[PDB]
Protein backbone atom coordinates (compact mmCIF):
# COMPACT_ATOMS: atom_id res chain seq x y z
CA UNK A 1 0.00 0.00 0.00
CA UNK A 2 2.91 2.31 0.88
CA UNK A 3 5.00 0.38 -1.66
CA UNK A 4 2.12 0.94 -4.11
CA UNK A 5 2.16 4.62 -3.06
CA UNK A 6 5.92 4.84 -3.77
CA UNK A 7 5.58 2.98 -7.12
CA UNK A 8 3.04 5.66 -8.15
CA UNK A 9 5.39 8.42 -6.96
CA UNK A 10 8.29 6.93 -8.95
CA UNK A 11 6.18 6.80 -12.13
CA UNK A 12 4.91 10.39 -11.69
CA UNK A 13 8.56 11.50 -11.21
CA UNK A 14 9.72 9.70 -14.38
CA UNK A 15 6.90 11.20 -16.43
CA UNK A 16 7.52 14.64 -14.92
CA UNK A 17 11.28 14.35 -15.68
CA UNK A 18 10.71 13.40 -19.34
CA UNK A 19 7.71 15.64 -20.14
CA UNK A 20 7.64 18.67 -17.76
CA UNK A 21 11.38 19.45 -17.52
CA UNK A 22 12.21 19.32 -21.24
CA UNK A 23 10.16 21.14 -23.92
CA UNK A 24 9.14 18.71 -26.64
CA UNK A 25 11.30 17.08 -29.30
CA UNK A 26 11.21 19.35 -32.40
CA UNK A 27 11.21 16.36 -34.78
CA UNK A 28 14.00 14.79 -36.83
CA UNK A 29 16.56 16.57 -39.02
CA UNK A 30 19.15 15.53 -41.60
CA UNK A 31 21.79 15.70 -38.84
CA UNK A 32 19.56 13.66 -36.52
CA UNK A 33 17.52 11.21 -38.68
CA UNK A 34 14.77 8.99 -37.25
CA UNK A 35 13.74 5.48 -38.23
CA UNK A 36 10.01 4.88 -38.16
CA UNK A 37 8.73 1.32 -38.64
CA UNK A 38 5.19 0.64 -39.98
CA UNK A 39 2.99 -2.49 -39.71
CA UNK A 40 -0.63 -2.99 -40.75
CA UNK A 41 -3.12 -5.34 -39.12
CA UNK A 42 -6.07 -5.41 -41.56
CA UNK A 43 -9.42 -6.09 -39.90
CA UNK A 44 -11.99 -5.55 -42.62
CA UNK A 45 -12.81 -4.23 -46.07
CA UNK A 46 -16.06 -2.62 -44.98
CA UNK A 47 -17.27 -1.09 -48.24
CA UNK A 48 -16.39 -0.94 -51.97
CA UNK A 49 -18.24 1.74 -53.92
CA UNK A 50 -18.10 1.20 -57.69
CA UNK A 51 -20.12 4.40 -58.38
CA UNK A 52 -17.28 6.53 -56.91
CA UNK A 53 -14.22 4.21 -56.90
CA UNK A 54 -13.78 4.45 -53.13
CA UNK A 55 -12.97 1.51 -50.83
CA UNK A 56 -13.14 1.64 -47.02
CA UNK A 57 -10.69 -0.25 -44.80
CA UNK A 58 -10.50 -0.83 -41.05
CA UNK A 59 -7.01 -1.58 -39.71
CA UNK A 60 -4.61 -1.11 -36.81
CA UNK A 61 -1.52 0.79 -37.87
CA UNK A 62 1.59 0.01 -35.75
CA UNK A 63 4.17 2.84 -35.61
CA UNK A 64 7.49 2.32 -33.84
CA UNK A 65 10.41 4.70 -33.28
CA UNK A 66 13.15 5.45 -30.70
CA UNK A 67 14.30 8.77 -29.17
CA UNK A 68 17.37 9.32 -27.01
CA UNK A 69 15.38 12.01 -25.17
CA UNK A 70 12.98 9.27 -23.92
CA UNK A 71 15.66 6.93 -22.43
CA UNK A 72 16.02 6.36 -18.69
CA UNK A 73 17.74 4.14 -16.14
CA UNK A 74 15.14 1.90 -14.41
CA UNK A 75 17.49 1.80 -11.41
CA UNK A 76 16.93 5.56 -10.95
CA UNK A 77 13.12 5.18 -11.11
CA UNK A 78 12.07 2.23 -8.92
CA UNK A 79 12.85 -0.39 -11.56
CA UNK A 80 10.23 0.98 -13.95
CA UNK A 81 10.96 -0.37 -17.45
CA UNK A 82 7.96 0.94 -19.42
CA UNK A 83 4.97 3.29 -19.14
CA UNK A 84 1.80 4.31 -20.99
CA UNK A 85 0.96 7.88 -21.89
CA UNK A 86 -1.45 10.02 -23.92
CA UNK A 87 -0.15 10.40 -27.50
CA UNK A 88 -0.71 14.18 -26.99
CA UNK A 89 2.08 14.16 -24.39
CA UNK A 90 4.71 13.21 -27.03
CA UNK A 91 5.90 13.79 -30.58
CA UNK A 92 4.39 11.37 -33.12
CA UNK A 93 5.30 10.97 -36.85
CA UNK A 94 3.19 12.60 -39.70
CA UNK A 95 2.59 9.36 -41.56
CA UNK A 96 -0.23 9.91 -44.02
CA UNK A 97 -2.13 7.89 -46.69
CA UNK A 98 -1.48 9.81 -49.94
CA UNK A 99 -4.79 8.93 -51.74
CA UNK A 100 -7.49 9.13 -49.04
CA UNK A 101 -10.81 10.62 -50.07
CA UNK A 102 -12.08 11.52 -46.57
CA UNK A 103 -10.44 12.34 -43.22
CA UNK A 104 -9.30 9.13 -41.44
CA UNK A 105 -11.51 8.15 -38.49
CA UNK A 106 -9.89 7.08 -35.25
CA UNK A 107 -11.44 4.01 -33.67
CA UNK A 108 -9.22 3.52 -30.56
CA UNK A 109 -7.77 5.49 -27.60
CA UNK A 110 -4.63 7.56 -28.47
CA UNK A 111 -2.18 6.11 -25.99
CA UNK A 112 1.49 5.18 -26.55
CA UNK A 113 3.80 2.73 -24.74
CA UNK A 114 7.34 3.99 -24.01
CA UNK A 115 10.19 1.63 -22.97
CA UNK A 116 13.33 2.65 -21.08
CA UNK A 117 15.57 2.39 -24.17
CA UNK A 118 13.44 5.29 -25.51
CA UNK A 119 11.39 3.20 -27.94
CA UNK A 120 7.79 4.27 -28.53
CA UNK A 121 4.99 2.02 -29.87
CA UNK A 122 1.78 3.74 -30.95
CA UNK A 123 -1.14 1.76 -32.51
CA UNK A 124 -4.10 3.83 -33.79
CA UNK A 125 -7.10 1.84 -35.08
CA UNK A 126 -8.45 3.66 -38.14
CA UNK A 127 -11.18 3.62 -40.83
CA UNK A 128 -9.80 4.91 -44.17
CA UNK A 129 -11.69 5.70 -47.42
CA UNK A 130 -9.26 5.70 -50.40
CA UNK A 131 -9.17 5.73 -54.23
CA UNK A 132 -9.90 2.26 -55.54
CA UNK A 133 -11.69 0.76 -58.57
CA UNK A 134 -13.34 -2.43 -57.30
CA UNK A 135 -14.00 -3.76 -60.85
CA UNK A 136 -13.78 -7.58 -60.87
CA UNK A 137 -14.31 -7.99 -57.12
CA UNK A 138 -17.25 -10.27 -57.94
CA UNK A 139 -15.17 -13.00 -59.64
CA UNK A 140 -12.49 -15.66 -59.13
CA UNK A 141 -9.66 -13.17 -59.90
CA UNK A 142 -11.05 -10.38 -57.68
CA UNK A 143 -10.00 -6.72 -57.53
CA UNK A 144 -6.66 -5.08 -56.71
CA UNK A 145 -6.13 -1.77 -54.93
CA UNK A 146 -3.15 0.15 -53.56
CA UNK A 147 -2.47 3.09 -51.31
CA UNK A 148 0.89 4.65 -50.38
CA UNK A 149 1.79 5.85 -46.89
CA UNK A 150 4.53 8.32 -46.03
CA UNK A 151 5.54 11.39 -44.12
CA UNK A 152 3.89 14.65 -45.25
CA UNK A 153 6.96 16.89 -44.84
CA UNK A 154 10.08 14.75 -44.16
CA UNK A 155 12.43 13.19 -46.77
CA UNK A 156 14.19 9.86 -46.33
CA UNK A 157 17.19 11.61 -44.79
CA UNK A 158 14.94 12.84 -41.95
CA UNK A 159 12.45 9.96 -41.53
CA UNK A 160 13.76 6.59 -42.66
CA UNK A 161 10.46 4.78 -43.17
CA UNK A 162 10.55 0.91 -42.86
CA UNK A 163 8.49 -2.26 -42.45
CA UNK A 164 9.81 -5.30 -40.46
CA UNK A 165 8.08 -7.51 -43.03
CA UNK A 166 6.33 -7.11 -46.41
CA UNK A 167 3.39 -9.30 -45.39
CA UNK A 168 0.36 -7.53 -43.94
CA UNK A 169 -0.88 -9.06 -40.69
CA UNK A 170 -4.13 -10.85 -41.59
CA UNK A 171 -4.46 -12.86 -38.34
CA UNK A 172 -7.32 -10.67 -37.05
CA UNK A 173 -9.09 -10.25 -40.41
CA UNK A 174 -12.92 -10.50 -39.95
CA UNK A 175 -13.97 -13.99 -41.06
CA UNK A 176 -17.50 -12.94 -42.07
CA UNK A 177 -16.50 -9.87 -44.10
CA UNK A 178 -18.36 -9.25 -47.39
CA UNK A 179 -14.82 -9.52 -48.88
CA UNK A 180 -12.17 -12.22 -48.59
CA UNK A 181 -8.46 -11.33 -48.83
CA UNK A 182 -6.51 -13.00 -51.65
CA UNK A 183 -3.30 -11.18 -50.64
CA UNK A 184 -2.08 -8.14 -48.71
CA UNK A 185 1.43 -6.66 -48.82
CA UNK A 186 3.19 -3.64 -47.31
CA UNK A 187 6.30 -2.76 -49.31
CA UNK A 188 8.91 -0.09 -48.78
CA UNK A 189 9.66 1.83 -51.99
CA UNK A 190 12.44 4.34 -52.56
CA UNK A 191 12.51 7.08 -55.18
CA UNK A 192 15.04 9.69 -56.22
CA UNK A 193 14.30 12.92 -58.04
CA UNK A 194 16.95 14.24 -60.48
CA UNK A 195 17.19 17.62 -58.64
CA UNK A 196 18.08 16.17 -55.33
CA UNK A 197 20.26 13.63 -53.43
CA UNK A 198 17.79 12.64 -50.71
CA UNK A 199 15.68 9.50 -50.96
CA UNK A 200 11.85 9.75 -50.83
CA UNK A 201 10.42 6.64 -49.20
CA UNK A 202 6.85 5.28 -49.30
CA UNK A 203 5.17 2.17 -47.93
CA UNK A 204 2.79 0.73 -50.54
CA UNK A 205 -0.17 -1.24 -49.20
CA UNK A 206 -1.52 -3.50 -51.94
CA UNK A 207 -4.68 -5.54 -51.32
CA UNK A 208 -6.21 -8.14 -53.65
CA UNK A 209 -9.73 -9.15 -52.64
CA UNK A 210 -13.05 -10.58 -53.82
CA UNK A 211 -16.66 -11.01 -52.68
CA UNK A 212 -16.94 -13.92 -50.21
CA UNK A 213 -19.23 -16.79 -51.22
CA UNK B 1 -25.66 23.06 7.40
CA UNK B 2 -26.07 24.08 3.70
CA UNK B 3 -23.20 26.40 2.67
CA UNK B 4 -21.11 24.31 5.18
CA UNK B 5 -22.17 21.08 3.48
CA UNK B 6 -21.36 22.88 0.19
CA UNK B 7 -18.04 24.06 1.71
CA UNK B 8 -17.26 20.52 2.94
CA UNK B 9 -17.84 19.06 -0.55
CA UNK B 10 -15.73 21.77 -2.21
CA UNK B 11 -12.93 21.04 0.30
CA UNK B 12 -13.15 17.27 -0.30
CA UNK B 13 -12.93 17.68 -4.08
CA UNK B 14 -10.02 20.14 -3.76
CA UNK B 15 -8.22 17.68 -1.43
CA UNK B 16 -8.71 14.71 -3.81
CA UNK B 17 -8.05 16.52 -7.07
CA UNK B 18 -5.85 19.50 -6.32
CA UNK B 19 -3.76 18.63 -3.28
CA UNK B 20 -2.73 15.42 -5.09
CA UNK B 21 -0.45 14.65 -8.12
CA UNK B 22 -2.06 12.86 -11.08
CA UNK B 23 -2.90 9.13 -10.82
CA UNK B 24 -0.65 7.78 -13.56
CA UNK B 25 -2.90 4.77 -14.19
CA UNK B 26 -2.43 1.14 -13.12
CA UNK B 27 0.76 -0.95 -13.13
CA UNK B 28 1.89 -4.50 -12.39
CA UNK B 29 2.84 -3.29 -8.88
CA UNK B 30 -0.45 -1.43 -8.48
CA UNK B 31 -3.07 -3.30 -10.58
CA UNK B 32 -6.74 -2.49 -10.96
CA UNK B 33 -9.96 -4.50 -11.42
CA UNK B 34 -12.56 -3.02 -13.80
CA UNK B 35 -16.01 -4.53 -13.86
CA UNK B 36 -18.18 -4.17 -16.93
CA UNK B 37 -21.88 -4.67 -17.54
CA UNK B 38 -24.08 -3.91 -20.59
CA UNK B 39 -27.62 -2.67 -20.58
CA UNK B 40 -28.69 -3.32 -24.20
CA UNK B 41 -31.27 -0.76 -25.32
CA UNK B 42 -31.72 -1.40 -29.03
CA UNK B 43 -30.33 -2.98 -32.20
CA UNK B 44 -30.98 0.06 -34.38
CA UNK B 45 -29.58 -1.05 -37.76
CA UNK B 46 -28.41 -4.24 -39.49
CA UNK B 47 -26.65 -3.65 -42.85
CA UNK B 48 -26.01 -6.77 -45.00
CA UNK B 49 -24.49 -4.79 -47.84
CA UNK B 50 -21.49 -4.00 -45.55
CA UNK B 51 -21.88 -6.44 -42.63
CA UNK B 52 -22.19 -3.71 -39.99
CA UNK B 53 -24.68 -3.73 -37.09
CA UNK B 54 -25.53 -0.75 -34.91
CA UNK B 55 -26.22 -1.08 -31.19
CA UNK B 56 -27.32 1.35 -28.49
CA UNK B 57 -26.44 0.39 -24.90
CA UNK B 58 -25.38 1.77 -21.50
CA UNK B 59 -21.94 0.50 -20.46
CA UNK B 60 -21.47 0.31 -16.65
CA UNK B 61 -17.80 0.62 -15.63
CA UNK B 62 -16.78 0.13 -11.98
CA UNK B 63 -13.34 0.32 -10.35
CA UNK B 64 -11.80 1.35 -7.02
CA UNK B 65 -8.77 3.54 -6.21
CA UNK B 66 -7.00 3.88 -2.86
CA UNK B 67 -6.25 7.49 -3.81
CA UNK B 68 -9.97 8.31 -4.00
CA UNK B 69 -10.85 7.19 -0.48
CA UNK B 70 -11.70 9.52 2.37
CA UNK B 71 -13.02 9.52 5.95
CA UNK B 72 -16.59 10.96 5.94
CA UNK B 73 -15.78 12.22 9.46
CA UNK B 74 -13.13 14.62 8.10
CA UNK B 75 -15.69 16.03 5.59
CA UNK B 76 -19.02 16.69 7.32
CA UNK B 77 -20.20 13.07 6.87
CA UNK B 78 -20.12 13.19 3.04
CA UNK B 79 -20.17 9.57 1.76
CA UNK B 80 -20.39 10.09 -2.04
CA UNK B 81 -20.18 12.75 -4.74
CA UNK B 82 -20.78 13.28 -8.46
CA UNK B 83 -18.10 14.81 -10.65
CA UNK B 84 -17.14 15.29 -14.30
CA UNK B 85 -15.39 12.20 -15.77
CA UNK B 86 -12.57 14.58 -16.86
CA UNK B 87 -11.66 15.31 -13.24
CA UNK B 88 -10.65 11.68 -12.78
CA UNK B 89 -8.77 8.83 -14.39
CA UNK B 90 -10.99 6.52 -16.48
CA UNK B 91 -10.17 3.17 -18.11
CA UNK B 92 -9.36 2.75 -21.83
CA UNK B 93 -12.01 0.12 -22.50
CA UNK B 94 -12.55 -0.18 -26.25
CA UNK B 95 -14.58 -2.29 -28.70
CA UNK B 96 -11.98 -4.19 -30.77
CA UNK B 97 -14.11 -4.57 -33.96
CA UNK B 98 -15.87 -1.19 -34.28
CA UNK B 99 -16.21 0.19 -37.83
CA UNK B 100 -16.96 3.88 -36.90
CA UNK B 101 -15.96 6.04 -33.90
CA UNK B 102 -18.24 5.25 -30.94
CA UNK B 103 -20.83 8.00 -30.35
CA UNK B 104 -21.54 9.17 -26.78
CA UNK B 105 -25.19 9.73 -25.87
CA UNK B 106 -24.99 10.75 -22.19
CA UNK B 107 -23.31 13.31 -19.88
CA UNK B 108 -19.76 12.35 -18.87
CA UNK B 109 -20.22 12.29 -15.09
CA UNK B 110 -19.12 9.67 -12.53
CA UNK B 111 -20.21 8.84 -8.98
CA UNK B 112 -17.44 8.43 -6.35
CA UNK B 113 -17.97 6.79 -2.91
CA UNK B 114 -15.83 7.21 0.19
CA UNK B 115 -14.15 3.76 -0.18
CA UNK B 116 -12.63 4.98 -3.46
CA UNK B 117 -15.15 3.23 -5.73
CA UNK B 118 -16.10 4.89 -9.01
CA UNK B 119 -19.13 4.01 -11.19
CA UNK B 120 -19.13 5.54 -14.69
CA UNK B 121 -21.92 4.75 -17.22
CA UNK B 122 -21.43 6.01 -20.78
CA UNK B 123 -24.44 5.50 -23.05
CA UNK B 124 -23.17 4.75 -26.56
CA UNK B 125 -24.13 4.04 -30.18
CA UNK B 126 -21.65 1.51 -31.67
CA UNK B 127 -21.22 0.27 -35.27
CA UNK B 128 -19.36 -3.07 -35.36
CA UNK B 129 -18.50 -5.96 -37.71
CA UNK B 130 -21.41 -8.33 -38.07
CA UNK B 131 -22.96 -10.51 -40.79
CA UNK B 132 -26.75 -10.39 -40.12
CA UNK B 133 -27.45 -13.42 -42.44
CA UNK B 134 -30.40 -15.40 -41.04
CA UNK B 135 -31.95 -12.43 -39.19
CA UNK B 136 -35.21 -13.25 -41.05
CA UNK B 137 -35.42 -16.86 -39.80
CA UNK B 138 -36.50 -18.63 -36.65
CA UNK B 139 -32.93 -19.16 -35.40
CA UNK B 140 -31.91 -15.58 -36.15
CA UNK B 141 -28.46 -14.05 -36.62
CA UNK B 142 -25.55 -14.13 -34.14
CA UNK B 143 -23.02 -11.34 -33.68
CA UNK B 144 -20.10 -10.88 -31.29
CA UNK B 145 -17.85 -7.99 -30.29
CA UNK B 146 -14.90 -8.07 -27.88
CA UNK B 147 -14.22 -5.26 -25.43
CA UNK B 148 -10.94 -4.66 -23.61
CA UNK B 149 -8.14 -2.26 -22.72
CA UNK B 150 -6.06 -0.82 -25.57
CA UNK B 151 -2.73 -0.77 -23.71
CA UNK B 152 -3.09 -2.77 -20.43
CA UNK B 153 -2.55 -6.50 -19.88
CA UNK B 154 -4.51 -8.57 -17.35
CA UNK B 155 -1.70 -8.00 -14.83
CA UNK B 156 -2.45 -4.26 -14.99
CA UNK B 157 -6.21 -4.15 -15.59
CA UNK B 158 -8.20 -7.26 -14.66
CA UNK B 159 -11.65 -7.22 -16.34
CA UNK B 160 -14.72 -8.91 -14.92
CA UNK B 161 -18.42 -8.86 -15.80
CA UNK B 162 -21.54 -7.96 -13.83
CA UNK B 163 -22.90 -11.55 -14.40
CA UNK B 164 -22.60 -13.21 -17.83
CA UNK B 165 -26.17 -12.13 -18.71
CA UNK B 166 -26.56 -8.83 -20.52
CA UNK B 167 -29.27 -6.63 -18.95
CA UNK B 168 -32.27 -6.64 -21.31
CA UNK B 169 -34.75 -5.00 -18.81
CA UNK B 170 -34.64 -1.70 -20.75
CA UNK B 171 -34.59 -3.21 -24.27
CA UNK B 172 -36.85 -1.21 -26.59
CA UNK B 173 -40.13 -3.16 -26.73
CA UNK B 174 -40.90 -2.08 -30.33
CA UNK B 175 -37.45 -2.53 -31.88
CA UNK B 176 -37.22 -3.89 -35.44
CA UNK B 177 -35.26 -6.78 -33.81
CA UNK B 178 -36.04 -9.08 -30.89
CA UNK B 179 -33.31 -10.49 -28.64
CA UNK B 180 -33.06 -14.28 -28.47
CA UNK B 181 -30.04 -14.15 -26.14
CA UNK B 182 -27.44 -11.65 -25.05
CA UNK B 183 -24.33 -12.68 -23.07
CA UNK B 184 -21.22 -10.86 -21.74
CA UNK B 185 -18.36 -13.27 -21.03
CA UNK B 186 -14.86 -12.83 -19.67
CA UNK B 187 -12.30 -14.55 -21.93
CA UNK B 188 -8.61 -15.17 -21.21
CA UNK B 189 -5.71 -15.78 -23.61
CA UNK B 190 -1.94 -16.36 -23.05
CA UNK B 191 0.92 -15.84 -25.52
CA UNK B 192 4.04 -17.98 -25.79
CA UNK B 193 6.26 -14.92 -25.15
CA UNK B 194 4.86 -13.84 -21.85
CA UNK B 195 3.37 -14.74 -18.43
CA UNK B 196 0.46 -12.21 -18.29
CA UNK B 197 -3.14 -13.03 -19.12
CA UNK B 198 -4.83 -10.98 -21.88
CA UNK B 199 -8.49 -10.60 -20.89
CA UNK B 200 -11.48 -9.60 -23.10
CA UNK B 201 -15.22 -9.35 -22.50
CA UNK B 202 -17.10 -10.99 -25.43
CA UNK B 203 -20.56 -9.52 -26.02
CA UNK B 204 -22.61 -12.05 -27.99
CA UNK B 205 -26.07 -11.12 -29.30
CA UNK B 206 -28.46 -13.54 -31.02
CA UNK B 207 -31.43 -11.78 -32.65
CA UNK B 208 -34.13 -11.86 -35.32
CA UNK B 209 -36.60 -9.59 -37.06
CA UNK B 210 -39.57 -8.90 -34.80
CA UNK B 211 -42.80 -10.11 -36.44
Amino acid sequence: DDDKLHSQANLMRLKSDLFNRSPMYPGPTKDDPLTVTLGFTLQDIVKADSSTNEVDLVYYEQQRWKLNSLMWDPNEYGNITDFRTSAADIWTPDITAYSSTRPVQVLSPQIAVVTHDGSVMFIPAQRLSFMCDPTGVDSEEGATCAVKFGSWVYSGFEIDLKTDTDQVDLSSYYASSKYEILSATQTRQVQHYSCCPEPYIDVNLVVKFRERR
Amino acid sequence: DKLHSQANLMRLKSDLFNRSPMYPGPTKDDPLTVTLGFTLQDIVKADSSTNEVDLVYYEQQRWKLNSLMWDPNEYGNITDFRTSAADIWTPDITAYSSTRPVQVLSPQIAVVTHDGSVMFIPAQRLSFMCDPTGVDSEEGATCAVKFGSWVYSGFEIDLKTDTDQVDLSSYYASSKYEILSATQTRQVQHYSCCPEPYIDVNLVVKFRERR
Binding site: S108, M121, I123 | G148, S192, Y198
Partner: peptide, 12 residues
Protein backbone atom coordinates in the same frame (compact mmCIF):
# COMPACT_ATOMS: atom_id res chain seq x y z
CA UNK C 1 -0.55 -13.45 -31.13
CA UNK C 2 1.23 -10.91 -28.96
CA UNK C 3 2.45 -8.93 -31.97
CA UNK C 4 -1.15 -8.44 -33.26
CA UNK C 5 -2.51 -7.45 -29.81
CA UNK C 6 -2.24 -3.72 -29.00
CA UNK C 7 -1.80 -4.50 -25.28
CA UNK C 8 1.27 -6.69 -25.97
CA UNK C 9 2.82 -5.68 -29.36
CA UNK C 10 5.19 -3.12 -27.76
CA UNK C 11 7.12 -6.14 -26.32
CA UNK C 12 7.86 -7.52 -29.86
Amino acid sequence: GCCSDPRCAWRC
